[PDB]
Amino acid sequence: SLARQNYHSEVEAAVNKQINIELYASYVYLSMSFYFDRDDVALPNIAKFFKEQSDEEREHATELMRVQNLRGGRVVLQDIQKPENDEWGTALKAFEAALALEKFNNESLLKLHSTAGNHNDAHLTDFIEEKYLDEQVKSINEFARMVANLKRVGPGVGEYVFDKEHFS
Amino acid sequence: SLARQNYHSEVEAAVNKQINIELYASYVYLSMSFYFDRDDVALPNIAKFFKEQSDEEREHATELMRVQNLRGGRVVLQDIQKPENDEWGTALKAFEAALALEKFNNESLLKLHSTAGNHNDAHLTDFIEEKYLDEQVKSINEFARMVANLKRVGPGVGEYVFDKEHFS
Amino acid sequence: SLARQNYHSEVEAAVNKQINIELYASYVYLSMSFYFDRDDVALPNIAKFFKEQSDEEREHATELMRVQNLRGGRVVLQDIQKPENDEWGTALKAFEAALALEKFNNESLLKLHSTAGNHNDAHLTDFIEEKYLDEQVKSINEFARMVANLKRVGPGVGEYVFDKEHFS
Amino acid sequence: SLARQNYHSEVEAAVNKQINIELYASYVYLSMSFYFDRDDVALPNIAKFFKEQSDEEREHATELMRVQNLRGGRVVLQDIQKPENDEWGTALKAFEAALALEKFNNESLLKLHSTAGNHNDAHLTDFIEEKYLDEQVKSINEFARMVANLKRVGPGVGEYVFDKEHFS
Amino acid sequence: SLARQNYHSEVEAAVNKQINIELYASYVYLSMSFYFDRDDVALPNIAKFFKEQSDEEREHATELMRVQNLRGGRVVLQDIQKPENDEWGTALKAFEAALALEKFNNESLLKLHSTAGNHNDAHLTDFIEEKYLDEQVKSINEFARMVANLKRVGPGVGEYVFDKEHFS
Amino acid sequence: SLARQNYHSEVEAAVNKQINIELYASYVYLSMSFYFDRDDVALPNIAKFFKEQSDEEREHATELMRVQNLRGGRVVLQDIQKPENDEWGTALKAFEAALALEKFNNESLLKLHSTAGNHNDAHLTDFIEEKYLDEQVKSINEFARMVANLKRVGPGVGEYVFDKEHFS
Amino acid sequence: SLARQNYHSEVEAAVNKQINIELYASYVYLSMSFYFDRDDVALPNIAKFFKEQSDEEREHATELMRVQNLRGGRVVLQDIQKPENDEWGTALKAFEAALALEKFNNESLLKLHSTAGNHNDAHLTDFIEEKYLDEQVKSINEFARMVANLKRVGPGVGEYVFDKEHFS
Numbered sequence A, B, C, D, E, F, G: 001s002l003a004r005q006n007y008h009s010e011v012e013a014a015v016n017k018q019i020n021i022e023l024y025a026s027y028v029y030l031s032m033s034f035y036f037d038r039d040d041v042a043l044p045n046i047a048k049f050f051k052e053q054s055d056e057e058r059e060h061a062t063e064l065m066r067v068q069n070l071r072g073g074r075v076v077l078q079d080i081q082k083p084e085n086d087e088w089g090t091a092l093k094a095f096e097a098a099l100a101l102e103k104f105n106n107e108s109l110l111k112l113h114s115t116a117g118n119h120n121d122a123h124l125t126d127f128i129e130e131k132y133l134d135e136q137v138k139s140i141n142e143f144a145r146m147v148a149n150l151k152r153v154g155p156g157v158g159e160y161v162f163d164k165e166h167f168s
């Protein structure tokens, strides 16, 4: 790359790893979406929410692919591992699994941020802070609040009311 | 003050005391707001309501600071004491505490009104009646009605439904 | 599923296989997009086109996930295999690879259609015909015409002119 | 908190300390506002300006209360100390006191930022930089320029002209 | 300065150095603009682009002059050195020279950023990150992509087509 | 140049000299602008005015670069010398220095005009008359009138009133 | 003429000569236009451009007829000589011929201007400067740039691309 400057080989590799983690998260949320779309689950606002989260994670991945090229690194893709489960249980259990995924995503981003800082990559630490770290804290908070509300409403009519009210 | 007329030193002091009581109430409602904003409480319409009540109490304080100057008294501020609790329990318990605060505010305003009347301050008794006493009766009634409804809906899904319906 | 009717296990499995093939095609086009986005390739209308094709293939996958649920089948996801290449060569070679992918997709869809027909699944043969087979013929034709034009314009200024004119 | 991640108890405590400092600054500016509102001071654009600054400092406090909750910390409020003065002297002396308050606020924010950095809290260092440090530099600069202009215009007609022109 | 706080003399000097580098870059792009405006070169969209880049570099300089004043440093200007060349050769050669200038500007900014960080200047590291480092990475990438396209189109009709298409 | 006609080498050289003088004037006004932007000077309408004057002088330079190319001459740039001062004293002293600069610019333009006339360059004498000599007379008149008004208003409140009123 | 004042017979004659030269140039461009309109040449944007240039030269002639009458001179017309060529070769050859015509027109205008100046005709020297000399310098520059671009693009596809792009 004619452009590459202050962009360490270790940071380039760490960006490729993070691209795969974001695509994995996109795939988990796609699975959760179509689980809540099942004819025997049928919580459509939850299903729609997880499809939107799947789309957001795919955009997290593509913006890292864009910055990889911007800095003169090379995008190297890996297999996207299928999610841990085919079925996600109650709304409460699924949102608990989503919270765990968001915290895993955050640990991964903080590791990437650390690697960038270790190599004095002021451009990429700022990029990760501005475009990833604040959104990730807001997402973890959102999922923690939804878990609190799913515990509050309980199973049955509460789950129905949550689906009808929480996303409108 | 070139303006001061029929404005008793005792009434001036009582207005300064009431300014501090209104600021204290503002601080209690700010505390209640951010308690309902907690990731493990997560009742956002209740949180928003208490922030609006905090703003209203701060306006109660500043309008008394304005009338203090209007009458040629001197504003003398005191420490704003922190609220009695850091945590406010169930929605029902928090609204019961808010009702008790509103009735305390009302007793304080009626005392101020009495002091003004004892000194034949027709301007300030009218000011307190028009701008404070009617609003305070309406606020106490509002909180009593919300306590009745929080008892009616009960804990769990009822608390969620109250948050989603009561403020829209 | 309370809904499932005239929907054979062999057809359900074939729909899950096709979902994976569509997600794979989405991943190939994402790879091609970011290759043409490289600072040493820099053909942005080609890059944008392949991102649009990536989005389209993901929609092909999610519409099969949707019809799986409509028929009372159960979505079962597999790993999304990384593409065969990290780098895709000239515009001509990349569009030739895309054409090969589209013909592979079409063979896969015709196999799924055959399996549906073997089980007298009149709903799913019509669904595949209406929503997949005509779009797939149009996509193969589009790619064949783009290959003809990339051969016509040749390398260098022709590739630049193709990028500037072909997607306007 | 189900959300809390990479958020040290020392940083949580430092955020609570800063919340109190912002509320204190809000109270100082409310005092200055009603001083310039006095019937024997009567500089209404200065009074309005300090009320706006009071409102801004309360927003500084509530945004730190919000980020405390976002990170899964727990808001702990303390008494809001009354300002050092009841009366604030000339416009020049009041704006000099305000400048000193702003520099105190800035030292406090840089201490909080240092504590966050010591614990590798990349989210909170970015939050403080983006939402606090640039605004604080601009506020100190604004107050320094207003002090320069209040020295330039001098007492009497200059103070009147400053009030009429500086906030238009 | 009544405002100056956490602003080291070494950082103040480094900001004055960067102001001169930005003005130098503005002058180089003004030279390149009027070279492409020559009656025997006559590539007017390239000329207009370099005039826009000259204007942008002057804005880079004036925003550093502004932050120098915001922090209570003192602007000290130096001679603006004339560019290395009076004539810039082919479009390809001129865009290669511009890419080298942008990478020089970036190394200079990263040095300024390092100096600020060495003095724990959280305000100025964030200012440089937010307003300089991402724009500088995007500019280097833009110039690298234009060099790739000028190699692709070749001399003669390709240069003409690039001028007519690349800036539209 | 295929275009060059009735364009003497002495006139071409004199245009290059005038381009440098205009860029020098631009740099002086940029210095004066950021001097009035200082936190201890803080006359923002004067600062804005000098920034506009800096922009105008840069346009004077670029229009001479344009006419150099129109006549088939060749732009040759020289170093832009830093201004005589880092600090410009009172508003009155700065405007007196600006007036001296404008009269210097005018003497320089009349010398260029004389050189053009000596070589019977009817095109360039008309160009200098139409685009430079009348605006230069109006600029000198503007600065003389501002000096008269800065003497009238005197130091202190007068300087503040001039800043607030003269550019509105 | 009751109007004639400071208008020498030599200047009147020189204006009649220049009217004929402008009409001649109009006829040359009409010829070039219909040459590019030929069924075996077929460059329609070049054809349209030369028709516009023919119209402009006729306007140059009629404005000199108008000023002849304004000054109380008498218009005396001569034969309009047919152009030097019936056919104008390549686009490059035609634009080189046009450039030579424009420089001839300019020599003629400067000789007219000299004659006017020799008779102290301040009105007519100003008229020629304002309405003829700057337009003529801009026209020569335009033709020189078009010759540079026609050399750049070369014969064949380049000539086609020039016709399609240069006049839109």
Ligand SMILES: [Fe+3]
Binding pocket: A022, A025, A056, A057, A060, A105
């Ligand atoms: Fe993510």
Ligand SMILES: [Fe+3]
Binding pocket: B022, B025, B056, B057, B060, B105
């Ligand atoms: Fe109240």
Ligand SMILES: [Fe+3]
Binding pocket: C022, C025, C056, C057, C060, C105
């Ligand atoms: Fe497909």
Ligand SMILES: [Fe+3]
Binding pocket: D022, D025, D056, D057, D060, D105
């Ligand atoms: Fe603050």
Ligand SMILES: [Fe+3]
Binding pocket: E022, E025, E056, E057, E060, E105
């Ligand atoms: Fe720059």
Ligand SMILES: [Fe+3]
Binding pocket: F022, F025, F056, F057, F060, F105
């Ligand atoms: Fe000038």
Ligand SMILES: [Fe+3]
Binding pocket: G022, G025, G056, G057, G060, G105
């Ligand atoms: Fe003419």
